[model samples]
Target chain A: KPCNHVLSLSFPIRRDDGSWEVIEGYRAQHSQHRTPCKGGIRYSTDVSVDEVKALASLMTYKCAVVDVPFGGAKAGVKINPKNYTDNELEKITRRFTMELAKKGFIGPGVDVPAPDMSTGEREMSWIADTYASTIGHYDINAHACVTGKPISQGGIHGRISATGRGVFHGIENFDLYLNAGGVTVSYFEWLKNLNHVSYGRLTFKYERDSNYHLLMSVQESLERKFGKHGGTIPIVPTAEFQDRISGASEKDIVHSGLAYTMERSARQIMRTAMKYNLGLDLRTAAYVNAIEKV
Target chain B: KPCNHVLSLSFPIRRDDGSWEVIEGYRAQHSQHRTPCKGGIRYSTDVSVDEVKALASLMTYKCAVVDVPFGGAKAGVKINPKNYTDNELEKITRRFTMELAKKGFIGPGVDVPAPDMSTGEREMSWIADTYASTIGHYDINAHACVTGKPISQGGIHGRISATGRGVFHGIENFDLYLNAGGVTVSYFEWLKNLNHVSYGRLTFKYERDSNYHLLMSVQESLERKFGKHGGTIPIVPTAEFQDRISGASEKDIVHSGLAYTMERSARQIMRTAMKYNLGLDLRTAAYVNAIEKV
Candidate 1:
């Protein structure tokens, strides 16, 4: 009804001082209605069973609302990243990776974990490599066990900003606007940067039909084309950056930026549910009782 | 009827490298209904007569709404601080001050300018000193020509964060929420700080009637009192800073921070005006005609 399963791991990792410290980690699979659960693994000292379960549950709601054919899940390890060295952190990650693999908590066909707070591509690469070694090289899709890997390690550019880009797309359709510089492998605005001379220059590009105003770097002409200093600099506009201004106007809602807050988004969704008379249980206990009665 | 007068000065200053550059400055008196006009002097390359007039007009509205007995005025210099050296900047400030005094625009009773945008206490002190010298030693209120001066130079601590602190008091009555660390000559939140052993420790001090939950660092108990390292370190609680979280809740509107933006604040007042039929005119031209008709 709520969290389907939670794999709690208590493993020891040797610090640089040759002392053993116990690390508590958890992977909460909130739902298994659909195949291949997906969520991010966070690293924080406050990582607890309830917190993971709460996060995992949101992922389930996230997937269901998005119409993605996947169950929801999340994982976390209790430790502050700032307190540990890179080598010690790597050892801890490797240890946690093996522990998760032994229990069959992480996998491509079962559960795919990505990076969250305090963990990124470096950690993901280690996770993929460690999990792959246990399964052998024959399984070509073993790399998919963990997401948010480096571009060189079979990770898509979109994965880095998938959530952000999705939020933009969601709002763009809804009809909204602030300039938070976000990258999208799909339509990475800054990457398509105009450096006066190298790539292109910035100018207002308006869609007459949609009445949408956007500033693109690759433009038609410029007044100051005689300068050689701005060869690599996107067509150097007179002054100011494109991000400062350039957006739609007149009976328009500006899409400020991507919203990556699960709690906020979930609460918004829940309000709609409650408003529509769609029964949604509050906690795990309440959820189970309701589901059991049904 | 709107702007009383605008003093526009075009002056030249000798730069560090024996180079001469022209600078444009403006001082607009928006109202003469009350004595001693009050506003700020901003420095920006885009400083214009229209901008100063708009800002000055807001000062008049702000004083009236807050029940302050003062007229409205503002000053501006057209130059980016970054392009000029510190010495060069001082010269520009001096020249601007002289120009304002020459036109009988700036004085204790005429117009008292404070800091705004790129100008602060350092610039205000220079202006005060320059203006005081010109008036001879006769007027004791010569230093009062500028508001945001250093405390050592006949200035008070409140002037530094006068506008910010004013907003807090303004909203405190309005019923609001957020941690914007603003200082006060009245009740500077951060300054009267507690450094565990030195001053005090962080605690949830609830005003019983007000229902305000402010995290003051000087209240009660802590588990680990056996330490000497945190003498100057604000009696910081276990893992976080006061800014992260704290404040009132329950049927409360959490003020995000002090509303320093006059444009945003002024517009809010205007909407209320149109709502209440208070008859506030728009634009200088419209306002002049409306006042003339009246």
Candidate 2:
């Protein structure tokens, strides 16, 4: 019920044409009932204090209802990002970091900004870099100040598609009939990520060669059988047929793999729902399942 | 009916500890009718020339089916990526690229490599760097030699999730019954990508505030209505009520947005399918549709 803070700041940036422009930014820290408020930073010309506050307030309750430990927060910068060059955008982003740092707003253990509208990995990378450099000392977790960075810069695999994947799972809660090709293929991607080795890394060539030899033997036998009759014999294109049977690409495998995963997971979720006597009506039961974690 | 070249190469790598080991890599160029060959490079210990040949041939056909102006090719290296450190991996990747460059296997107008199993932007960046430096000049389009390099290095936005999105669209052609939350929400993400703005970006906060004020007014009126004849005038807890009305989050919005997309897209696909008077007996018509496109 209590919204802890609403911080607004206006900063100045120097344009390339030797002029200064004032930019407005906001931070709405909705709650600290749990520390390190989490949300996204949207860059736009229409951002205002009232909108920021509303989003921030919503985040607080959303976390509670979803049973996440952290509270909610949100921020926005009022400017059209495309109006600026990459350099100009970097300067503005750095200054925004400085302003937030002055009031102890942005931190790994405080408000952490993720990518939102008009901002993405590039902006988040700039934010992390600015936040780290502004702290004036090496903080091991400086990258933690923001999320959705490029993996080389400390973001993890799957973060790019996290929202999409999450929605896929959520859809399961809504309709078991939903096709799950997305989730299924992503699982194979996850398998690659966890193992740090691509599937079939060692065996694809051997399997390919073995299948080729097998096809050759079959073709040779068929030709020998037709040779005695001395007549035109219809034969399937050997190379293409063998390729179809034994030369499926990793991509092709993933296609099949996704089908299997979708079929299996859907059935599993349905069986679990039945076993638990869960109502399939609304998401209330699902919400209760999540809320119970808190 | 034309299947193209299959090239195989074996190279030696010196481990960080100075032990020499032989590694094998293969590139199957399925078609060249469109100039550059497009496919992925997978690093695995199981790669074989036979598999590469099969995959390469498939690529030639796949590109035509998809109507992309490119030929298909596939490649893989036989190794367990987990067994190598980043430094060791870099050396191996560079050596592999050097071999390909020597044979004109990799180039912007030759074979452009994208991230595949066990390889991503990080690995791609290294490959680009190796190719550029090996050519011994600042080739203006060296970065174009690859398609999945890091954005800072020249990779474009939306490549990572392009396949999934394409599949989502393909699902529309196949079965309108497919739940389309993924496609719809992604359209929102795409809207954010294209306009350098998010949908409802400018108005989210205003909507939040207006809805909040409207909710407060309704609560006040209810209290006033019950006050004049108070006999345990029942009022639901404000916290819960507000949470219900004024507390929607981005996730909540996406939920509604997904429902809208799923319902709308399904209906639209059906209407189009019917207007065309195409016989839709399960996937028979759907198969014919894709088969004709190829």
Model 1 spans > 4 angstroms off: A175-294, B1-294
Off by over 4 Å in 2: A61-68, A173-294, B1-294
Quote each prediction's TM-score.
0.33, 0.34
Q: Please, what is the whole-model Cα lDDT of each candidate in the order they appear?
A: 0.54, 0.58
| CAPRI docking class of candidate 1 | incorrect
Give the per-residue lDDT of model 1 (tens digit) for A1-294: 588889998998888988989999999987777667777788998889999899787666545543344576888999999999999889888888888877878877778787776888799878878876665232324556766666444444344445555555544433001111111121121111110010111011211110111011111111132344434332333334333323222102112223332223344445545554466443333233223322
Against the native complex, each candidate's DockQ, computed on alpha carbons, is 0.01, 0.01
Q: lDDT tens string, model 2, B61-165?
A: 444333233456778999999999898899888988889888877875567776676887788888889988886245555666666665576544445554555
Task: Indicate which candidate wins on TM-score.
Answer: 2
Cα lDDT tens digits for candidate 1, B1-294: 368889888999898999988998999988653445677788998889999998787666555443233467888898889988999889999878888887767776566777766987789888888987885246555765766566566554334444555455544433001111121121111111111011112222322211112112221211135343423222222222222224222101111212322222344445555654466333333233223222
Residue-level lDDT for B224 in candidate 2: 75
Worst 10 residues of 2 chain A by lDDT: A175-184
